[PDB]
């Protein structure tokens, strides 16, 4: 694709607006947007987690207006925010008291907030904390895990092309690919880490590269991808579950001629 | 269709007011505090007391009568939290940090939020626990389903009343609010330090990327705020939300529009 001039005019520009619900594991309907309580394995050798215990990458493939009868939709600007940040102030619902007579323990600890806009499926690289971890039937995970899978194994390449499938802890955006995607992610690890969530409708991310070219939507398809593990909920018994929230996306696209 | 800005002596006006916090106000002695927080036994039996739920504050300020067709356009905001130094009262009915120690200062989960708009702030509902029973006198997500815990598009509302919209049910709807600028930060966690800056030298510009600010329909400016500063632990160990008032100063100018 040799990129040429941008189309101008009333009909040269379009907008895509949607939300991605979180895939935290959903152990029963009462706990939608939570993971299952986290079990710790006895040894590295015998680590076989339940499927509803593994948060997954969320993905949306949004069809854009048909262009052919050579134009492509170019993603220019993104607006995004986490939906329902104030829900984390429910500190009265089945929590563990901070101390005697105290309010509930609020959602806190390890968090991963991540969003991507691209003209093709997000490209993943596999890295495993423990290579002998047995990921469950129904998830897509690094196959033929060797000892070198714990630092870097180039065999573990995949496309984020399915929901409730790619576990967060196996997969990261592949920095060797993703030429046609813009991705942003922050892991704030630790056990007592405060969530810091900003909301505003005044903040815009520009998706153009150093050459002034944004993601080009192949087959007139925009690929939105997100993870928002806000932290962990401690319930009365002391058990801890991941809690996640949906993510709003608004993408401005424009028609671009290519050769 | 937005056209030229009016100039001249009489082309510009100013709105200055404070919004008191609605923290719950369990008795007159505790104005600007919530009731002590009860933790429920299960998710299914969570029925909080009305005076335990902080609420969005809102002010609808009439502007000079105008109206070929002029509207007041909000250009610049100055805002700050009033009474930040009150959180140094560490000698009044608190729980000692340790033996012979000073009181425990207000700390933990905080949500600071302010909005300026030409119409009521538009709200989206997200529930921590969908089976939470919100009390008569509050306005909350009706017909809560399982999907209400992540995203249910049925839960749309207007912040059109005081002491009514609980903070933990409602967030600004990012799908609407074209005619509002909103800013919010949740700093969750149990021991989180409040960080409150005050200055009369800081100005927020409310103009969008096209140089257009919020247009006040019916000559009405809509100010909205939440300032849950954290929690007060009293001698017994029980914890109450503490909030503070918010100053607003909005500079508006006359703008001609069409239709």
């Amino acid at each position, epitope marked *: 694709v040799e990129v040429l001039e941008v189309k101008t005019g009333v009909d040269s520009i379009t907008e895509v607006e949607c939300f991605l619900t979180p895939e935290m594991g959903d152990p029963d309907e009462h706990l939608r947007g939570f993971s299952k309580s986290i*079990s710790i394995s006895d040894t590295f050798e015998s680590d076989s987690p339940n499927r509803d215990m593994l948060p997954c990458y969320s993905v949306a493939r949004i069809p854009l207006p048909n262009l052919n009868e050579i134009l492509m939709w170019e993603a220019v600007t993104l607006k995004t925010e986490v939906i329902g940040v104030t829900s984390l102030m429910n500190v009265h619902s089945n929590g563990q008291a901070t101390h005697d007579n105290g309010a509930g323990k609020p959602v806190q600890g390890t968090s991963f907030h991540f969003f991507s806009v691209g003209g093709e499926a997000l490209e993943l690289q596999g890295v495993l904390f423990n290579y002998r971890t*047995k990921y469950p039937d129904g998830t897509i995970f690094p196959k033929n895990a060797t000892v070198q899978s714990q630092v870097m194994n180039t065999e573990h390449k995949a496309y984020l092309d399915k929901n409730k499938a790619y576990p967060v802890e196996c997969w990261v955006p592949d920095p060797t690919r993703n030429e046609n995607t813009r991705y942003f992610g922050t892991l704030t690890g630790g056990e007592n880490v405060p969530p810091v969530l900003h909301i505003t409708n005044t903040a815009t991310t520009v998706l153009l590269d150093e050459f002034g070219v944004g993601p080009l939507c192949k087959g007139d398809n925009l690929y939105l991808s997100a993870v928002d593990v806000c932290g962990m909920f401690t319930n009365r018994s002391g058990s801890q579950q991941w809690r996640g929230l949906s993510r709003y996306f608004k993408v401005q696209l424009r028609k671009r001629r290519v050769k | 269709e937005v056209l030229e800005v009016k100039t001249g002596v009489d082309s510009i006006t100013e709105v200055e007011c404070f919004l008191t916090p609605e923290m719950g106000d369990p008795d007159e002695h505790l104005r600007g505090f919530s009731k002590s927080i009860s933790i429920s036994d299960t998710f299914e039996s969570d029925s909080p007391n009305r005076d335990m739920l902080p609420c969005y504050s809102v002010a609808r300020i009439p502007l000079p009568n105008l109206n070929n067709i002029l509207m007041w356009e909000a250009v610049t905001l100055k805002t700050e939290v009033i009474g930040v130094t009150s959180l140094m009262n560490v000698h009044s009915n608190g729980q000692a940090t340790h033996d012979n120690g000073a009181g425990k200062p207000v700390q933990g989960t905080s949500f600071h939020f302010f909005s300026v708009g030409g119409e009521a702030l538009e709200l989206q509902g997200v529930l921590f626990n969908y089976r939470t029973k919100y009390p008569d006198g509050t306005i909350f997500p009706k017909n809560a389903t399982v999907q209400s815990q992540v995203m249910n598009t049925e839960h749309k509302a207007y912040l059109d009343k005081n002491k009514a919209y609980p903070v933990e049910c409602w967030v600004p709807d990012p799908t609407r609010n074209e005619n509002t600028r909103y800013f919010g930060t949740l700093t969750g966690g149990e021991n989180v330090p409040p960080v409150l800056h005050i200055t009369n030298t800081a100005t927020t510009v409310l103009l969008d990327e096209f140089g257009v600010g919020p247009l006040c329909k019916g000559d009405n400016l809509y100010l909205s705020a939440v300032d849950v500063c954290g929690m007060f632990t009293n001698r017994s160990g029980s914890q109450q939300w503490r909030g503070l008032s918010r100053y607003f100063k909005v500079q508006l100018r006359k703008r001609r529009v069409k239709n």
Partner: single-chain antibody, 236 residues
Framework: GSYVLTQPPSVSVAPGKTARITCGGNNIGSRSVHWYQHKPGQAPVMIISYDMNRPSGIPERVSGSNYGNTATLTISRVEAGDEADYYCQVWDSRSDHPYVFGTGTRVTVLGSTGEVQLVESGGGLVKPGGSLRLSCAASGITFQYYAMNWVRQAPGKGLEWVSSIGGRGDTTYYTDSVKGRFTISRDNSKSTLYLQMNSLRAEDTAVYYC?????????????????WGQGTLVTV
């Protein structure tokens, strides 16, 4: 053919001693294995999911592993109560036999021998070539978010998966031995699962069990039966 799970027909242990039920499978170690306990007359309970995970209720005594060409259930401090049939089960999404059960292991002890409900109807006597409608009335769950299944146990034989349906009724799968004859369906509003069994043969006589899968936002298949109905016997 199908994937094959081989189990020892029977195992004997004294009270206190530990019991080991093996589940042999061609590279079973790279598949998630689930274990079901079944006492005669009662609803099967899931005791292990995803190789080694214990549901609320099942004690620490019960233990699961899965490594080589063999997965292993281990009941450690054995009691009279532990006497039952134990089945291992795997899931092969996208194959002609998606839900595969082991042949079953009967454990004998040689010392001195309620939010979710699934209520079943429709069973009884019917003649060869005749019809019959099984129903399973769920309560306490939003039905459309749960893939549902029919499993049967012929007199003498072990558990055999019969049919599976998605939460929205989108996906339908059958065993090769019932393809053109049995039809599975749902009424999410009435919150019940149906099996329309017509053109019935003699080898269909079995206790028909209603089997629920774990919650899924789409009502997708997950390959585990986390709760069972008490079962209904069809004879011919």
């Amino acid at each position: 053919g199908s994937y094959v799970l081989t189990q020892p027909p029977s195992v004997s242990v004294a009270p206190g001693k530990t019991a080991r039920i093996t589940c042999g499978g061609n590279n079973i170690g790279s598949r998630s294995v689930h274990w079901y306990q079944h006492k005669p007359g009662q609803a099967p309970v899931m005791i292990i999911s995803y190789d080694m995970n214990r549901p609320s209720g099942i004690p620490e005594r019960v233990s699961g592993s899965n490594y080589g060409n063999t997965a292993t259930l281990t009941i450690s401090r054995v009691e009279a109560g532990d006497e039952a049939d134990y089945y291992c089960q795997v899931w092969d999404s996208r194959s002609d036999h998606p839900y595969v059960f082991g042949t079953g292991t009967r454990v004998t002890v040689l010392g001195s021998t309620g939010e979710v409900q699934l209520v079943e109807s429709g069973g009884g006597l019917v003649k060869p070539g005749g019809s019959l409608r099984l129903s399973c009335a769920a309560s306490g769950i939003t039905f459309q978010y749960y893939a549902m299944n029919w499993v049967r146990q012929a007199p003498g034989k072990g558990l055999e998966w019969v049919s599976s349906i998605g939460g929205r009724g989108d996906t339908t799968y059958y065993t090769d031995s019932v393809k053109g004859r049995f039809t599975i369906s749902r009424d999410n509003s009435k919150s019940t699962l149906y099996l329309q069994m017509n053109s019935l043969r003699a080898e269909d006589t079995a206790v028909y069990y209603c089997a629920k899968e774990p919650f899924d936002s789409s009502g997708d298949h997950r390959g585990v039966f986390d709760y069972w109905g008490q079962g209904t016997l069809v004879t011919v």
